[PDB]
Amino acid sequence: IQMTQSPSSLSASVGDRVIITCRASQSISSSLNWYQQKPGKAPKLLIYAAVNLETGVPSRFSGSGFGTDFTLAISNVQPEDFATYYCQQSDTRTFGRGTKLDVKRTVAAPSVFIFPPSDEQLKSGTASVVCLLNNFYPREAKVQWKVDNALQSGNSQESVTEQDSKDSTYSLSSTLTLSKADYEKHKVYACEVTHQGLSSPVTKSFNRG
Amino acid sequence: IQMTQSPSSLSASVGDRVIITCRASQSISSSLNWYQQKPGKAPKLLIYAAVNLETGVPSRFSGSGFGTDFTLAISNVQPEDFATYYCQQSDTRTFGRGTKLDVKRTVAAPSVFIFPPSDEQLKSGTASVVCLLNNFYPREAKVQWKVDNALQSGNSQESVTEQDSKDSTYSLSSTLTLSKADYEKHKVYACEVTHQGLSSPVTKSFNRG
Amino acid sequence: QLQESGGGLVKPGGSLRLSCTASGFNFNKYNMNWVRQAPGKGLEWVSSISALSTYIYYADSLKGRFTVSRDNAKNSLFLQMNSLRDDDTAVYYCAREIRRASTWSADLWGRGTLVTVFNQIKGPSVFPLAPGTAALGCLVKDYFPEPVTVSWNSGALTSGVHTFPAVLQSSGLYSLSSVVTVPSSSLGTQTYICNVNHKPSNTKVDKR
Amino acid sequence: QLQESGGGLVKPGGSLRLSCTASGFNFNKYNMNWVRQAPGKGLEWVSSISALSTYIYYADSLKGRFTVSRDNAKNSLFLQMNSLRDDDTAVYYCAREIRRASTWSADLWGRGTLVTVFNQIKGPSVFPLAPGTAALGCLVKDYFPEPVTVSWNSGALTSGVHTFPAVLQSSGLYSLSSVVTVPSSSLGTQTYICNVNHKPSNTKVDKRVEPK
């Protein structure tokens, strides 16, 4: 009983019709559930037994399917409806990989910034470097940290904002954590960004330490 | 079974004979244990069944008693001996209040210092004031914090060092931790010490809060 | 030859399982007990359990809240504490018991595991993040628990502000960043302030 | 309402017991389940338990390490996890299951509590203690886990040095103090530096103390 979901990523605009499909390796009859999870929130049940809708679910959400193939449809996608969706095998309680639904938009290159460690923080004994991507679409981005010629990962923690309502863009904050002794040993610091809108890697740096 | 230990605190000098006593509310025959705990170390069994010495224990340690009254005697107190001691009722495994043995010496007055918060710490957003008592006997001492001739209660931490082998004196560090906003609001900051060697309470203060 | 585990920070009303593993001797043939010493206080016996788990005894004060268990196959001892409280803050020792002279004495002991019951609260440390179109920000760095409120210019700055979601560091402390898009011309003439409020620590900060 | 508790930091190889408390519904009549989601990953079903504990189901991967129990008198259910691993870092939700159309669905969910499996390491923040005998010092603060070793002048200065025992702060981080008694005259002509080593973070900080 392996559960597959399609599409893995979907981009839609308000007023469009969105369709997610979940295929089961073998027939599960109508024992298929659909859930909605918004970023950083607990899941919500939409449909149960393939076609039956839960209370509090907008009627624009519709369920269909029998046997192996099932479908979830949002008739008039709204800003509220953009979230991550899953299919679960009701009897076996097996969840699907999930589908992320975000607003459709033209590719926008990120605006890169690199902020050096603050003199206030350096006195404490710890130094943290921040690389900022401000307004880009799609969300997918590759951030690399190189100190002097090369640095590897394991020191970096990343954070991405949720898509903006007005501009439909994402912003990313990558923070590199270093010790005072280790930071002052090296002079150059840099971060490299890669993204569909970026034809060539954008790398911004500062020289002190 | 209720048991009492006396003396609660005892001071001796190397080469002395030290006597500690444990009393039982009812007769417990020979069901009494003696332990010693050095600072920041696990308890160690010295005497079991009132009179029996545990393996690896110096012979100077001696146990005696039957019924209600028992005694632990150290014939030749040595630097290793100086520690805290407990008596446990063997049948009920109930411990006594405990007895503290420290090196005896002349009363010495503490040297008080007060250290203002470093601007480096204030940049972070925290303010720490430190008051340092040093090289004083007996260990008992009271430290009070005053800001605007106003006493502080729950924002103080104290830490005492172990008795020094060479001079048998103590030292204590009291720290007043405040928010960056709190430190700026007030001007004066002081710590008041009172101790047997101090005929009058000693107060050290600074301004420019 | 007894090593202890399971110590840490517990919320008031929480639960924790302490463990003591034995080496160098037959754990299966020997009885065991648990003793605790609160900071700057005397040792207090907690529980005793037989080598076969046949006989088990607890302290009256720790009634209904503590449970002791052991698996001799794994040569391990266990203390399960529930409904934990501040009075339970102490270093817990595991010790081997030996029956000599029709009495029970503790001859082996463990180094100890520290259990402290309190709500963790750390105030945030705010650090500046300054560089035609420019970006500046604030870093809240270490704090606990999560909720932190960031505003710029006492609420004057609006849409340029993007406050990133908190990330948990290796320190066990949450850290977030707040950025804002501003005119490059304003860098010389205007000052931008970030108001970070962390109510658990009752802290209100303005930076830059 | 489903209220959860027990989440927090767990040392690798440790154990943790989660709790979920019920309100507003007949806890004894309804089935309950546990679900987890790793950071930046999809939802994963963990375990299910019947209303009377007659039927208990686990995920095959974590069957021997995870245990599910419930106390309907307390309107609470519990998950005991042992030999915890990095893969177990996730937010654990408790949800009620309801049988409709001869199938089970989860209609009521809990907010969730985060379980993160890792060894806590922060590192020290060193601050100077600025002052014919004068007192100097350095303040190691907000450092985890113990130990921390303080030296003065790379081991040259051993006289008058009193490194105090660490105190656990409300932050859950240890703080120690190191002081040194020196001649007041030397403050103008000599440099005093405090060398702090924290091997858990492998952090070495040197801070010079100068009069205020």
Author numbering:
A (entry chain L), B (entry chain l): 1 to 209
C (entry chain h): 3 to 133, 141 to 217
D (entry chain H): 3 to 133, 141 to 221
Text lifted from the article:
Upon reaching the mildly acidic interior of early endosomal compartments, GP undergoes a pH-dependent intracellular receptor switch to disengage from α-DG and bind to lysosome-associated membrane protein 1 (LAMP1). In this study, we present high-resolution epitope maps of the GPC-A mAbs 25.10C and 36.1F determined using cryoelectron microscopy (cryo-EM) and X-ray crystallography, respectively; 25.10C is a highly potent and pan-LASV mAb, while 36.1F is moderately potent and lineage IV-specific.
Although the Fab-GP interface in the 25.10C-pfGP-TD cryo-EM reconstruction contains interpretable amino acid side chain density, we also deciphered the 25.10C Fab paratope using X-ray crystallography. The weaker density of the Fab CH/CL domains observed in our 25.10C-GP cryo-EM reconstruction suggests that the presence of a potential flexible elbow joint between the 25.10C constant and variable domains could impede packing of the Fab into a crystal lattice. To restrict the number of possible elbow angles, we introduced a single residue deletion coupled with a bulky, four-amino acid substitution to the heavy chain elbow domain (ΔS112 and S113AST116 to F113NQI116). Crystals of 25.10C-FNQI grew in space group P1211 and diffracted to 2.6 Å. The complementarity determining regions (CDRs) for both the heavy and light chain of 25.10C had clear density and could be completely modeled. Interestingly, a domain swap occurred between the CH domains of two 25.10C Fabs, resulting in a dimer that comprises the asymmetric unit. In contrast, the 25.10C dimer observed here is likely due to the elbow mutation and crystal packing, as no evidence for a Fab dimer is observed in the cryo-EM data with wild-type 25.10C Fab.
